[PDB]
Amino acid sequence: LHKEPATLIKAIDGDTTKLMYKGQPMTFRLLLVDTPEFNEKYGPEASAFTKKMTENAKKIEVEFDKGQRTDKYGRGLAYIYADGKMVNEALVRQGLAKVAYVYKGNNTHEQLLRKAEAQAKKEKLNIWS
Numbered sequence: 001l002h003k004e005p006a007t008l009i010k011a012i013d014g015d016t017t018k019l020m021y022k023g024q025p026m027t028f029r030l031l032l033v034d035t036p037e038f039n040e041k042y043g044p045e046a047s048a049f050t051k052k053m054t055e056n057a058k059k060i061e062v063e064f065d066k067g068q069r070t071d072k073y074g075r076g077l078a079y080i081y082a083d084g085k086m087v088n089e090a091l092v093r094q095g096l097a098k099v100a101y102v103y104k105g106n107n108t109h110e111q112l113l114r115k116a117e118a119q120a121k122k123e124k125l126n127i128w129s
């Protein structure tokens with residue numbers, strides 16, 4: 001896989017963001033994770049976490065996987081990086097997202113994220129508290 005440039009347009013919630021990619025506004029949905037909705041327990045915390053990480057970033061990048069690049073809603077499906085650190089993985093490591101929606105052929109970082117989830121669960125963090 002490879003990283004490509006994007007810039008943040010606006011934060012949305014814990015697992016969706018509005019980015020400009022190849023010069024066009026797109027909503028991205030983070031591959032392989034599920035944050036709580038804002039109206040759910042840890043939803044506000046997840047939204048705040050992804051907002052901080054993406055707004056504070058000097059450099060946002062998107063990394064598509066090998067399979068579909070947009071979902072049925074027209075959201076881009078990618079791994080999102082903020083100054084080289086993957087937002088998807090960070091969310092899972094802090095217990096603010098579960099590994100979820102692992103479809104065959106867009107699951108390159110599955111095991112990295114599962115290892116993070118295991119550490120978050122061992123630490124009884126947030127969703128695992």
Ligand SMILES: Cc1cn([C@H]2C[C@H](OP(=O)(O)O)[C@@H](COP(=O)(O)O)O2)c(=O)[nH]c1=O
Nearest residue numbers: 029030031032033034071072077101103106
């Ligand atoms: C993460 C992800 C979600 N989706 C679709 C499946 C779910 O359909 P349904 O809307 O029919 O439940 C929805 C979950 O996204 P959200 O968690 O943002 O709601 O997004 C994909 O199709 N591919 C993906 O990789």
Ligand SMILES: [Ca+2]
Nearest residue numbers: 034035036037
């Ligand atoms: Ca969600």
